[PDB]
Amino acid sequence: YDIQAWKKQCEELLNLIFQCEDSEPFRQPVDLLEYPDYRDIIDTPMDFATVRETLEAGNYESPMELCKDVRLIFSNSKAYTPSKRSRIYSMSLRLSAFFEEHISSVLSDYKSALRFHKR
Numbered sequence: 001y002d003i004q005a006w007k008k009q010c011e012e013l014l015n016l017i018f019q020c021e022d023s024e025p026f027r028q029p030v031d032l033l034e035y036p037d038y039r040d041i042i043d044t045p046m047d048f049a050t051v052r053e054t055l056e057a058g059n060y061e062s063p064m065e066l067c068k069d070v071r072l073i074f075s076n077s078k079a080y081t082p083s084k085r086s087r088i089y090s091m092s093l094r095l096s097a098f099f100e101e102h103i104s105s106v107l108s109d110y111k112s113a114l115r116f117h118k119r
C-alpha cells in the first residue's frame with residue numbers, strides 16, 4: 001500500500017528498457033535529419049529519455065501518466081512506420097510487449113494503494 005513505490009519501480013523498468021537492444025531507436029527523440037517528414041506524420045514526439053527525465057524531475061504524478069507517454073512512443077512508431085514488417089516497428093512491438101508485461105503490476109499496486117488510502 002505504498003503510494004510512492006511506483007516511482008522507483010518505473011525507474012527500474014526504464015533501466016531494463018535502456019538495456020534492451022530493442023529500445024535503441026526510441027532512447028532519444030527521432031532524428032529529423034534521418035527522417036525529414038517525421039513531424040508531418042507525428043504530432044507529439046516521445047522517447048524514453050524524455051520519459052525518464054520527466055519522471056526524475058518529479059513531473060509525473062502517477063504511473064498512469066508515465067504509461068501514457070511510453071504508449072505514445074509505441075503509437076508514434078506504428079503511425080510513422082512505412083510497413084508493419086519494418087525493422088524498427090518490429091522492435092517497438094517487442095519492446096511494447098515487454099513494457100506492458102512489466103507495467104501491469106506497477107499500475108495495479110499503485111491503484112490498490114490509492115484505494116487503501118481512500119478506504
Ligand SMILES: O=C(O)c1ccc2ncsc2c1
Pocket residue numbers: 025030035076077078080081082083086087088089
Ligand atoms: O523506417 C522505419 O521503418 C521506421 C519505422 C518506425 C519508426 N519509429 C521510429 S523511427 C522509425 C522508422
